């Protein structure tokens, strides 16, 4: 029940998860995962790595190379991806062993794969091994670090400044900078570019082909949102933390806003400052940031989103797993409340993998029992949904050749919450799609 600080083999027998808690850089995804794999592959179990992104998927591809891992015999595939597949009729192998790294990732496909896995295991079919610096429940934002770090709480630029604030721009090393939002980051790049800084923008969209920039020289300010906290490594100096996050809350069951900005977890707050503070013969890496944290209330929608795919993912017979035990108080929904019969579940599937809406816009559209191709909901709904952009109602030519004011029938704060967003609720409501 208890984390672990080292990987022992007993912790490949079914019905065994392990939770491995080393502190950030400590070697958890470079040194253990490769030693674990060794040891599956020693004994013929039937394994599956998770990464959270492809870019780390990418990277371990590369660290396990030379070792039988197929990247979509140990399988090796991003979390989303898992989720993706138990959500078609693929049934996926019976895997005996899941390897989950990064096993604080908080989006729905992630949260719900660790309650998939932890039934499984609890099923007494599979052993699991969760690796995380920061488990649910944790209340530590100082772990240890492989050097010390330099905390200070200061005032964070929460837009762009025209005066003050020198100690942003005089520093020398390169800088990352967790904002709470694409919007806010855009606001604090266009800033600092100004300054004559040269900057990149990482956000869940464009993280694939911007975090390669990363690996250069040539680069002052690295501005992102929460993704980065997934096992992005940069090699950076200093880390400027807003400490604050948006909150999607579903008010009444009939809309999705987007709450706050207000104050992260403290598992967000030891993942962001863990970014730095890597390199044990490098003294002096610094952490400035702007405020305090707190834990997640009971109405964060991503658990909830999470059961809406538990509810449609199969198990054995008529069985629906559960979410992982230390994150199942998140959500007030009872077990099958949200189980579509079979062409919804196409459809539901389809809105997310196709048309790139949140999970719990989807599941309204297709529990409506509107199929994927029909567009007629973006545009009817209440006066009090109608989207803007620069203060005008947003327009779009239709299929069908009639502009449109977007007015969608289930309003989810984001779908319109940045310019790349909205760009694509627009096409979708059109019935266009970009080249993926
Ligand atoms: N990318 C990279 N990192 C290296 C290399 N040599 C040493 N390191 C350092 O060792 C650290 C430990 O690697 P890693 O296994 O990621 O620790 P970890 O516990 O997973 O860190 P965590 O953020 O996800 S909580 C790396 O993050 C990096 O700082 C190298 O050749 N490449
Ligand atoms: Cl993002
Ligand atoms: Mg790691
Ligand atoms: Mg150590």
């Given at each position: 029940?208890?984390?672990?600080?080292?990987?022992?083999?007993?912790?490949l027998?079914?019905?065994?998860?392990?939770?491995?808690?080393?502190?950030?850089?400590?070697?958890?995804?470079?040194?253990?995962?490769?030693?674990?794999?060794?040891?599956?592959?020693?004994?013929?179990?039937?394994?599956?790595?998770?990464?959270?992104?492809?870019?780390?998927?990418?990277?371990?591809?590369?660290?396990?190379r030379?070792?039988?891992?197929?990247?979509?015999?140990?399988?090796?595939?991003?979390?989303?991806?898992?989720?993706?597949?138990?959500?078609?009729?693929?049934?996926?192998?019976?895997?005996?062993?899941?390897?989950?790294?990064?096993?604080?990732?908080?989006?729905?496909?992630?949260?719900?794969?660790?309650?998939?896995?932890?039934?499984?295991?609890?099923?007494?079919?599979?052993?699991?091994?969760?690796?995380?610096?920061?488990?649910?429940?944790?209340?530590?934002?100082?772990?240890?670090?492989?050097?010390?770090?330099?905390?200070?709480?200061?005032?964070?630029?929460?837009?762009?400044?025209?005066?003050?604030?020198?100690?942003?721009?005089?520093?020398?090393?390169?800088?990352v900078?967790?904002?709470?939002?694409?919007?806010?980051?855009?606001?604090?790049?266009?800033?600092?570019?100004?300054?004559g800084?040269?900057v990149?923008?990482?956000?869940?969209?464009?993280?694939?082909?911007?975090?390669?920039?990363?690996?250069?020289?040539?680069?002052?300010f690295?501005?992102?949102?929460?993704?980065?906290?997934?096992?992005?490594?940069?090699?950076?100096?200093?880390?400027?933390?807003?400490?604050?996050?948006?909150?999607?809350?579903?008010?009444?069951?009939?809309?999705?806003?987007?709450?706050?900005p207000?104050?992260?977890?403290?598992?967000?707050?030891?993942?962001?400052?863990?970014?730095?503070?890597?390199?044990?013969?490098?003294?002096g890496?610094?952490?400035?940031?702007?405020?305090?944290?707190?834990?997640?209330?009971?109405?964060?929608?991503?658990?909830?989103?999470?059961?809406?795919?538990?509810?449609?993912?199969?198990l054995?017979?008529?069985?629906?797993?559960?979410?992982?035990?230390?994150?199942?108080?998140?959500?007030?929904?009872?077990?099958?409340?949200?189980?579509?019969?079979?062409?919804?579940?196409?459809?539901?599937?389809?809105?997310?993998?196709?048309?790139?809406?949140?999970?719990?816009?989807?599941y309204?559209?297709?529990?409506?029992?509107?199929?994927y191709?029909?567009?007629?909901?973006?545009?009817?709904?209440?006066?009090?949904?109608?989207?803007?952009?620069?203060?005008?109602p947003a327009?779009?030519?239709?299929?069908?050749?009639?502009?449109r004011?977007?007015?969608?029938?289930?309003?989810?704060?984001?779908?319109?919450?940045?310019?790349?967003?909205?760009?694509?609720?627009?096409?979708?409501?059109?019935?266009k799609?970009?080249?993926?």
């Amino acid at each position: 029940e208890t984390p672990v600080e080292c990987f022992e083999p007993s912790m490949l027998k079914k019905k065994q998860l392990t939770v491995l808690d080393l502190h950030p850089g400590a070697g958890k995804t470079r040194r253990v995962l490769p030693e674990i794999v060794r040891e599956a592959i020693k004994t013929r179990l039937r394994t599956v790595i998770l990464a959270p992104t492809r870019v780390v998927a990418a990277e371990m591809e590369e660290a396990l190379r030379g070792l039988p891992v197929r990247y979509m015999i140990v399988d090796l595939m991003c979390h989303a991806t898992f989720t993706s597949r138990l959500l078609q009729p693929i049934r996926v192998p019976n895997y005996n062993l899941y390897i989950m790294d990064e096993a604080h990732f908080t989006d729905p496909s992630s949260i719900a794969a660790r309650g998939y896995i932890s039934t499984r295991v609890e099923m007494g079919e599979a052993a699991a091994i969760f690796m995380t610096a920061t488990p649910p429940g944790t209340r530590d934002a100082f772990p240890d670090s492989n050097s010390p770090i330099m905390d200070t709480e200061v005032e964070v630029p929460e837009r762009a400044w025209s005066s003050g604030f020198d100690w942003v721009t005089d520093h020398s090393g390169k800088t990352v900078w967790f904002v709470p939002s694409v919007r806010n980051g855009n606001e604090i790049a266009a800033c600092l570019t100004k300054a004559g800084k040269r900057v990149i923008q990482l956000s869940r969209k464009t993280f694939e082909t911007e975090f390669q920039k990363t690996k250069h020289q040539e680069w002052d300010f690295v501005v992102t949102t929460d993704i980065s906290e997934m096992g992005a490594n940069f090699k950076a100096d200093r880390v400027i933390d807003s400490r604050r996050c948006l909150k999607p809350v579903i008010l009444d069951g009939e809309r999705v806003i987007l709450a706050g900005p207000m104050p992260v977890t403290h598992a967000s707050a030891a993942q962001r400052r863990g970014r730095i503070g890597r390199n044990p013969n490098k003294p002096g890496d610094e952490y400035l940031y702007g405020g305090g944290c707190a834990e997640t209330d009971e109405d964060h929608a991503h658990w909830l989103e999470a059961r809406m795919l538990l509810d449609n993912i199969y198990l054995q017979d008529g069985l629906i797993a559960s979410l992982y035990r230390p994150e199942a108080d998140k959500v007030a929904a009872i077990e099958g409340e949200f189980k579509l019969r079979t062409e919804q579940r196409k459809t539901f599937v389809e809105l997310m993998k196709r048309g790139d809406l949140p999970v719990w816009l989807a599941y309204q559209v297709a529990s409506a029992g509107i199929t994927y191709t029909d567009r007629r909901w973006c545009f009817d709904g209440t006066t009090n949904n109608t989207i803007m952009e620069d203060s005008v109602p947003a327009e779009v030519w239709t299929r069908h050749g009639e502009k449109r004011v977007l007015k969608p029938r289930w309003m989810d704060a984001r779908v319109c919450s940045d310019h790349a967003a909205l760009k694509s609720f627009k096409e979708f409501a059109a019935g266009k799609r970009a080249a993926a």
